[PDB]
Write a protein that binds this ligand. Structure first.
Ligand SMILES: N=C(N)NCCC[C@@H](NS(=O)(=O)Cc1ccccc1)C(=O)N1CCC[C@H]1C(=O)NCc1cc(Cl)ccc1CN
Ligand SMILES: *[C@@H]1O[C@H](CO)[C@@H](O)[C@H](O)[C@H]1NC(C)=O
Ligand code: NA
Ligand code: NA
Lengths: 11, 252, 31
């Protein structure tokens, strides 16, 4: 339901 | 937020969304109190009855948001946590007494038109404004009703502080001096409340003395959402400010 | 902190939001 956030924040 | 309205752009620039990394979902609200510190409710991070015990690496904060679900490119900023601090006398076993926590960000966030800190109350501002009938404002992306559903954008509701005997008489829980309650009475012709997902967000008041917004409360608990004869309960930020200050002074 | 609680799109521009007056009207102390 949430738009994917940029991968940089999940690293 | 039940029976609120859509926020205006930049209306609550201290609003923070606590966001779970995996699965990606809303966890809670929170507020920005400086370029490096975010305030929330302890039960957003630690609540053993519901098997909740998040660590720093489980979570992100999202600051500057308006839309609930969108990635707000060039507006919101996403920060990682350096460290969580939960009040050492937070009482999750009984009544959520001292329901307060701080999160230190890994790097300072840049302020903007959409990102700006709220003030914490001094003793005198708290004494003046924390009075029955005086209204504060609650914001969040939590559910729109107790049973259902969820908002497109940040919701806002203004609610009056309630006399302490009325708060106490609305519940079987032991209320403490570290809590206050707010909401309309059944006979008052207006309604509104926080709800699931609004936990940890701010109850703010605009001082009429210096025209600044102060965070008086943290969204803590309520028996359902927006039920007649129930009220929302908020952590009394001023009463816990010495602890806030001790944490920031020691670890900031 | 010196600038806390003053919103860029409201207080900093002397613009009021649509419901803040409801809060002010509830504050009796200091009138
Ligand atoms: N045990 C009691 N007799 N009273 C305390 C219940 C506190 C709990 N409420 S609850 O989750 O809706 C469950 C409930 C419902 C009706 C009666 C008893 C219990 C609650 O609010 N909790 C339990 C842990 C998380 C927090 C919460 O949901 N906070 C969000 C919140 C905050 C506010 Cl200010 C208003 C409403 C809500 C939504 N319930
Ligand atoms: C919360 O979880 C952490 C996991 O790092 C654990 O060390 C701690 O004992 C837990 N606290 C409670 C009250 O369960
Ligand atoms: Na009671
Ligand atoms: Na109610």
């Amino acid at each position: 339901d949430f738009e994917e956030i940029p991968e940089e924040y999940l690293q | 937020i039940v029976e609120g309205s859509d926020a205006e752009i930049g209306m609550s620039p201290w609003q923070v969304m606590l966001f779970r990394k995996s699965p990606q979902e809303l966890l809670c609200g929170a507020s920005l109190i400086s370029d490096r510190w975010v305030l929330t409710a302890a039960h957003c991070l630690l609540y053993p009855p519901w098997d909740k015990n998040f660590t720093e690496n489980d979570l992100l904060v999202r600051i500057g948001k308006h839309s609930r679900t969108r990635y707000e490119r060039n507006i919101e900023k996403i920060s990682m946590l350096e460290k969580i601090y939960i009040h050492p006398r937070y009482n999750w076993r009984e009544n959520l007494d001292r329901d307060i926590a701080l999160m230190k960000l890994k790097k300072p966030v840049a302020f903007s038109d959409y990102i700006h800190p709220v003030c914490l109350p001094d003793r005198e501002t708290a004494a003046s404004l924390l009075q029955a009938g005086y209204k504060g404002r609650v914001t969040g992306w939590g559910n729109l009703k107790e049973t259902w559903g969820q908002p497109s954008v940040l919701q806002v509701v203004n609610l009056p502080i309630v006399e302490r005997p009325v708060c106490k008489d609305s519940t079987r829980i032991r209320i403490t001096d570290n809590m206050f309650c707010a909401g309309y009475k059944p006979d008052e012709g207006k309604r509104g409340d926080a709800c699931e997902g609004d936990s940890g967000g701010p109850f703010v008041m605009k001082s009429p003395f210096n025209n600044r917004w102060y965070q008086m409360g943290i969204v803590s608990w309520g028996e359902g959402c927006d039920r007649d004869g129930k009220y929302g309960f908020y952590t009394h930020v001023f009463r816990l400010k010495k602890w806030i200050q001790k944490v920031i002074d020691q670890f900031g | 902190e010196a600038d806390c609680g003053l919103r860029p799109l409201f207080e900093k521009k002397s613009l009021e939001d649509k419901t803040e007056r409801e809060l002010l009207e509830s504050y009796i102390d200091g009138r």
